[PDB]
């Protein structure tokens, strides 16, 4: 299955695109 | 590490100095920063340089977005590749891709379809059904795991498939993926018969 690391990376990439245009402590779990 | 999106914006903005960019340059840099994921700083510098090395043979007064996307595809996929020659088998492949695209659009709980193409680049690839990407899920602000959220969401519509007040379970949501994979074979069987079944529609049946 898609792990939480991949899910949080996916979230991070989306956030980074939202920083590019229109200009988190869970890894332990 | 490799440059991120903001680093891509900064590197392309610095290396775009001294070059004529057509129209609003901010939009062009935005698109070429969205469309160059994983690239290095020297790769972005080269892509900016190679665009200005162009517009001489083509005699374009300024660097434009379609040509920028042309080099973006070129420097990571090689040759532009020719389209499939027109034939009866080409028409059948178009029919198979159309049936697959229609069943993908009619499948509840799926991401929006970006584009269905008959002509692609590279060597071993043909027609394709490309869905929306991050650079598309950004604009229409949507959860990254929206595909996972599509099961329990109610009263929505994606592509050509509507979902009412009864949510789709995980069983029905994943079992709805079998219909687009079977639609390629179903089109040939319905329109031609058993002897019309081909090797074009054989790979999805093995993952069903």
């Amino acid at each position: 299955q898609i792990t939480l690391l991949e899910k949080l990376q996916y979230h991070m990439q989306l956030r980074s695109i939202k920083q590019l245009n229109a200009t988190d402590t869970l890894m332990s779990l | 590490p490799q440059p991120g999106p903001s680093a891509r914006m900064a590197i392309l903005r610095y290396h775009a100095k001294g070059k004529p960019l057509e129209g609003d340059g901010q939009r062009l840099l935005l698109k070429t920063a969205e469309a160059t994921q994983g690239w290095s700083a020297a790769a972005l510098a080269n892509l900016m340089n190679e665009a200005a090395i162009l517009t001489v043979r083509r005699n374009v007064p300024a660097i434009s977005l379609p040509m920028v996307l042309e080099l973006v595809e070129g420097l990571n996929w090689g040759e532009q590749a020719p389209r499939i020659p027109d034939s009866e088998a080409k028409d059948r492949l178009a029919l198979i891709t159309a049936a697959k695209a229609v069943a993908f659009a009619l499948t509840p709980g799926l991401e929006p379809i970006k584009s269905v193409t008959m002509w692609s680049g590279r060597r071993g690839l043909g027609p394709s059904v490309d869905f929306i990407a991050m650079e598309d899920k950004a604009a229409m602000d949507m959860h990254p795991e929206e595909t996972e959220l599509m099961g329990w969401r109610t009263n929505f519509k994606t592509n050509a498939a509507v979902v009412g007040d009864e949510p789709l379970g995980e069983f029905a949501h994943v079992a709805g993926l079998l219909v687009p994979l079977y639609a390629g074979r179903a089109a040939e069987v319905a329109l031609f018969g058993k002897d019309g079944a081909s090797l074009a529609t054989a790979q999805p049946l093995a993952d069903c």
Partner: protein
């Protein structure tokens, strides 16, 4: 979390998260104590409570 709280000699609940940062996940954490059990003897009542 309710059954872990009412089950005797169980680990203390640390944090119960249901989609913490709009991420599709949910978990009930427990403190990883170095005292008590570790590996000495596993009672059948303890194993049944865990199950």
């Amino acid at each position: 979390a309710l059954l872990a709280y009412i089950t005797p000699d169980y680990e203390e609940i640390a944090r119960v998260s249901v989609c913490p940062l709009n991420v599709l996940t949910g978990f009930t954490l427990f403190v990883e104590d170095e005292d008590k059990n570790v590996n000495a003897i596993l009672t059948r009542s303890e194993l049944e409570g865990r199950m």
